[PDB]
Write a protein that binds this DNA or RNA. Structure first.
Lengths: 94, 71, 141, 136, 38, 176, 164
RNA sequence: GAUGUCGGCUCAUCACAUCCUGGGGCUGAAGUAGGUCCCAAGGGUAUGGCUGUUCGCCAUUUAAAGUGGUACGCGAGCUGG
RNA sequence: GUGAAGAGGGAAACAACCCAGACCGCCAGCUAAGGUCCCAAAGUCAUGGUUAAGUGGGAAACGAUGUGGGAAGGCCCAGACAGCCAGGAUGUUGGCUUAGAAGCAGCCAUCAUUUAAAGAAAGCGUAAUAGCUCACUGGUCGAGUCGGCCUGCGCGGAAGAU
């Protein structure tokens, strides 16, 4: 159903990931198939109000990064200690 | 804002309305508004004694020629 | 509030509207005189046997003036009569105290015909099925 | 109420938490109540919280309970000074820490499970927030 | 009637109204529901 | 929210004179029909009142319906005149009007001495019936409220002065 | 958008039969009161006349999607419409049964085979003669409305203005 | 290198979280009466016995016989009971 | 670490805090933490967002019909949002129960009738019917609104010896 976009991670380690969460962004990863795990940054409040419907996990996803499209479903979610805001989410190719 | 005092008698804080201080002796509302903005005891007593307000639209400094100021 | 109500319920034997207790209190609170109501109630019951419960539906105007429709007895009274049950089970469907055929319901439906709103003799019957079901009666085709 | 059957030793250290929990997501239920932050619970709340949820939900579904007061905690009597061995035994404590899910459900209809979980939270000494599982 | 704290709705016609910094329950079905604080 | 969006569109031959925030509604057949909008700012246009935010207040849509309501009330005030038939239930109390004076009893040894504002007049068919006449929707209820101060329609046996919305719900006697 | 078809579907539906109808009758009430109504709803389905009480949102939208003759001027305000596509005499008769218990002035207009039929003429349609007189009255209705009616109206406005 | 008490006389003062009148809301309150009760420091708030007694018991008045603090008020005031 | 064994600046005076490690004298400048309307040295700052509490600048449980922004999304002139009026019906006054039993005293029924339409009833009340609003329908009504979630701001709770 839902049609999103993503960026590839410029810097990785604690300092870059804190500078995402300071600015209401969070990280994620897309694994599976014959091909490598793909690390991306996402925007928190773009996707938080999409994932209010179950089709973001149940039905397949349009995800565009550098004009590449592979088809995807969402996987399990990591949340902040005292906020329901998304600290990190995992995804699988579908 | 009820201008609180306890001169020495009767249980309670004692008080005075906001309404008296403009309706009766109308100078006092400005006097004890600039008062706390001045330094310690003695120099603020010399700063303070330079203000007069009088009753209102009845000032007596006609002969000094006051320079009007809008704030 | 204006104090108008459409379709006030009362259910009382035809021979029992001379005392106030078969009438209960509720007419009294809305300003319907129990004596005046008793002259209005005997005028459509003269062809019904005494002790047989008469349906009465009342409309009341702002000044507690009142108009009354008196009816031939309920489908429920006749459906109890026709199955040979004195009273129902107090559980619809799950408790059975008889059964009733469709042809009997059709004879009820025609006795009810001026009270019935239905566009069909079939429609009229369909209304009293669920009344039969309420009294612990099976409507078998 | 949930508690450990028997314990290795009779007396243990009070402890503290380092600032994270590991059952922060719902994993027994399909929804639950999350602790927000941190504190102590005297086992009185476990009891009161199950009681609060069962009077509202009754025989529609199951409750899963995730807190148990595995740790003894002493009070030092008013007649006895400090530095003199630990006090008489006072209460048994479950330690909640940031993100710890307290109570979980599935069987009960979600909106009835939400009302039940608001009620348990009044029995608790701190503000809480309801969490839902989703697909993942 | 009791002053209380924390407001809940005793009837569908409790309007519930904030006059100054205090919530009064004001009702126009029954006057019985007139809780002074929420 | 439907009446916070309402455009008013004032009727013909009502003269609606705007100093910005004070609006004074003038016309034929009535006097003293006005608003000071203070939480919200009102532009008139030609006759289409438009509701938005004022400087130094925070509420939004909350007072905007209120300002709309109050301008329209006034417009109704000057045109037709708002309803007038006032009455009382309960023996030995009365609401008998006699000139500027409304004559009533509370068992009191002093006159209760309830009187009509210089901005209204009234007259009486019966000692429990009052008809008040005038063109301000505020004032007719404003003298009625002092009449209701100590004579409110009670929630058990209902006696009081009866006008507009009324709180009586019926209550029962101690159980037998 | 609607979530459901029901509110859009009934507009197309009512224009479809009401454009067709060989007789229809257009009336006003906003709370018809049920006792009289339930029994005329009964009696309409005894005659094979169909009766709707129907919204101005719906009526305005009816005008919008489907072209109408002679019924669109009586749509203004709260409106019931009873209508028949077969046995036109019954549509107008059902109103003369209702009039016994109601205001006979409550009619705004009727339509007959696409001709506009005035509040006075419909009383004549509601008479319902047996069949030789019936077919002859149905024709009288139509012949009258096409061209006689024009001349009727042009006189009815002139009298009011005429001063002595 | 000193903040020192009970009980008893004298003299108090401050917080109102009011014993009470005074204006008012509810009541499963008709009115009476009881239950519920907000506002409010302004003001009044008893005496003999026994005992070294705080507290106890008893007799009694008045519409009435308060709540909290004070080096658990007060020997640079009184007395060792 | 700091005081202990260290001045000064900031905090209202505050041994241990934040900045800093005082040779001494400097009526020379910058900068730190902290400040910048006056006490008191400097921003009543420029640009945009929001709020009624002296909240700000005093804290929780808890609670609702307090108020705005935002994106994703349903509703959305095919009439919203959801209040007011009018209708509120046929079986039916369901069954049992009871003086009588009427949606609402209790329990079981959770359905059916001409219908564009009216729950065998969401909430009140009644010793309990009675009286009442209510959707839905059809008048008024002619445009924004709310639930999920991110986000600013409020609230009462928050009463003691000067």
């Amino acid at each position: 159903m839902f049609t999103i976009n993503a960026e590839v991670r410029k810097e990785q380690g604690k300092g870059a990931s804190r500078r995402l969460r300071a600015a209401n962004k969070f990280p994620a990863i897309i694994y599976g198939g014959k091909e490598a795990p793909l690390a991306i940054e996402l925007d928190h409040d773009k996707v938080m109000n999409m994932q209010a419907k179950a089709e973001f996990y149940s039905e397949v996803l349009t995800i565009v990064v550098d004009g590449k499209e592979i088809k995807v479903k969402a996987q399990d979610v990591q949340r902040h200690p005292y906020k329901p805001k998304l600290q990190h989410i995992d995804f699988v190719r579908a | 804002k009820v201008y609180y005092h306890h001169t020495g008698h009767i249980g309670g804080i004692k008080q005075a309305t906001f309404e008296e201080m403009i309706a009766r002796r109308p100078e006092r509302v400005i006097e004890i508004a600039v008062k706390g903005m001045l330094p310690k005891g003695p120099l603020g007593r010399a700063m303070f004694r330079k203000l007069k307000v009088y009753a209102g639209n009845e000032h007596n400094h006609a002969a000094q020629q006051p320079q009007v100021l809008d704030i | 509030a204006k104090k108008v109500q459409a379709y006030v319920k009362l259910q009382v034997a035809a021979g029992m509207a001379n005392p106030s207790p078969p009438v209960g209190p509720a007419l009294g609170q809305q300003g319907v005189n129990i004596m005046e109501f008793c002259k209005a109630f005997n005028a459509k019951t003269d062809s019904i046997e005494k002790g047989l419960p008469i349906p009465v539906v009342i409309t009341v105007y702002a000044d507690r003036s009142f108009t009354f429709v008196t009816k031939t007895p309920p489908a429920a009274v006749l459906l109890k009569k026709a199955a040979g049950i004195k009273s129902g089970s107090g559980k619809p469907n799950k408790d059975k105290v008889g059964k009733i055929s469709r042809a009997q319901l059709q004879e009820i439906a025609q006795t009810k015909a001026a009270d019935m709103t239905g566009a069909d003799i079939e429609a009229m019957t369909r209304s009293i099925e669920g009344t039969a079901r309420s009294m612990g009666l099976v409507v078998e085709d | 109420m949930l508690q450990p059957k028997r314990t290795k030793f009779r007396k243990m250290h009070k402890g503290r938490n380092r600032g994270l929990a590991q059952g922060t997501d719902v994993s027994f239920g399909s929804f639950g109540l999350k602790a927000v932050g941190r504190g102590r619970l005297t086992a009185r709340q476990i009891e009161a919280a199950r009681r609060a949820m069962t009077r509202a939900v009754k025989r529609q579904g199951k409750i899963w309970i995730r807190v148990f007061p595995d740790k003894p905690i002493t009070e030092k009597p008013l007649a006895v000074r400090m530095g003199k061995g630990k006090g008489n035994v006072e209460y048994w404590v479950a330690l909640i820490q940031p993100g710890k899910v307290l109570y979980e459900m599935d069987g009960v209809p979600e909106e009835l499970a939400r009302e039940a979980f608001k009620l348990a939270a009044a029995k608790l000494p701190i503000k809480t927030t309801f969490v839902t599982k989703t697909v993942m | 009637m009791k002053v209380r704290a924390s407001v809940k709705k005793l009837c569908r016609n409790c309007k519930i109204v904030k006059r100054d910094g205090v919530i009064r329950v004001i009702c126009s079905a029954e006057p019985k529901h007139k809780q002074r604080q929420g | 929210s439907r009446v916070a969006k309402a455009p008013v569109v004032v009727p013909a031959g009502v003269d609606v004179k705007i100093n910005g925030q004070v609006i004074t509604i003038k016309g034929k057949n009535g006097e003293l029909t006005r608003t000071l909008n203070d939480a919200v700012e009102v532009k008139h246009a030609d006759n289409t009142l438009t509701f938005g935010p004022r400087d130094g207040y925070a509420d939004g849509w909350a007072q905007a319906g209120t300002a709309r309501a109050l301008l329209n009330s006034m417009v109704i005030g000057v045109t037709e005149g708002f309803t007038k038939k006032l009455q009382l239930v309960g023996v030995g109390y009365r609401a008998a009007v006699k000139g500027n004076v409304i004559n009533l009893s509370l068992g009191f040894s002093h006159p209760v001495d309830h009187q009509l504002p210089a901005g209204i007049t009234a007259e009486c068919p019966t000692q429990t019936e009052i008809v008040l006449k005038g063109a301000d929707k505020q004032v007719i209820g404003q003298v009625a409220a002092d009449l209701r101060a100590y004579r409110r329609p009670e929630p058990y046996k209902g006696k009081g002065v009866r006008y507009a919305d009324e709180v009586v719900r019926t209550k029962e006697a101690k159980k037998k | 958008a609607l979530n459901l078809q029901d509110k859009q579907a009934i507009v197309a539906e009512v224009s479809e039969v009401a454009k067709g109808a060989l007789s229809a009758v257009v009336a006003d009430s906003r709370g018809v009161t049920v006792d009289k109504m339930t029994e005329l709803r009964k009696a309409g389905r005894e005659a094979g006349v169909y009766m709707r009480v129907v919204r101005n949102t719906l009526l305005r939208r009816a005008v919008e999607g489907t072209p109408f003759e002679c019924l669109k001027d009586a749509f203004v305000g709260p409106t019931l419409i009873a209508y028949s596509m077969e046995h036109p005499g019954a549509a107008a008769r059902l109103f003369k049964e209702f009039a016994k218990a109601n205001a006979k002035f409550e009619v705004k207009a009727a339509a007959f085979e696409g001709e506009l039929i005035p509040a006075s003429q419909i009383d004549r349609l509601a008479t319902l003669p047996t069949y030789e007189e019936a077919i002859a009255r149905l024709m009288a209705t139509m012949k009258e409305a096409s061209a006689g009616k024009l001349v009727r109206t042009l006189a009815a406005v002139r009298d009011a203005k005429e001063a002595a």
